[PDB]
Each structure stands twice: as structure tokens, then as C-alpha cells.
């Protein structure tokens, strides 16, 4: 689906609106195409802890 399921998957909402704000969309396009941390810094991904949830949730996205 759209981004929203998969950041509430690895349970952190107010990500989406954050992807979107970064034109960010598709997350298994991201999750096969963009792997970093500064991309989530990019997105605003502050907490580490949120940003390595969100390296894993796009690792969790099938390559």
C-alpha cells in the first residue's frame, strides 16, 4: 500500500507526513533503492532509535 502501514508496522507514526515532506513514497521502492542514514536524517528521522527501526523497516522490505 502507500506509506502509513509500514511506519506503523515498526510502530512510528508522524513518519509518513515526514516521507511524503521529503517526496519520499513507495517504501519498497525506498527500501530497494535508498539505504541510509542520512536519508533519515533527510526525512527528519531524528531518534536514532526511530532511524535504525526505519533502516530495519526498509530492510524488512523485500529486495
Do not use: C
Not at 506503523?8 to 513507495?26: C, K, R, T, V
Not at 517504501?27 to 539505504?35: C, D, E, L, P, Y
Amino acid at each position: 500500500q502507500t506509506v502509513g502501514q509500514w511506519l506503523e508496522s515498526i510502530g512510528l507514526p508522524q513518519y509518513e507526513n515526514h516521507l511524503m515532506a521529503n517526496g519520499f513514497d513507495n517504501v519498497q521502492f525506498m527500501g530497494s533503492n535508498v539505504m541510509e542514514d542520512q536519508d533519515l536524517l533527510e526525512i527528519g528521522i531524528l531518534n536514532s532509535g526511530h532511524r535504525q527501526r526505519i533502516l530495519q523497516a526498509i530492510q524488512l522490505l523485500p529486495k
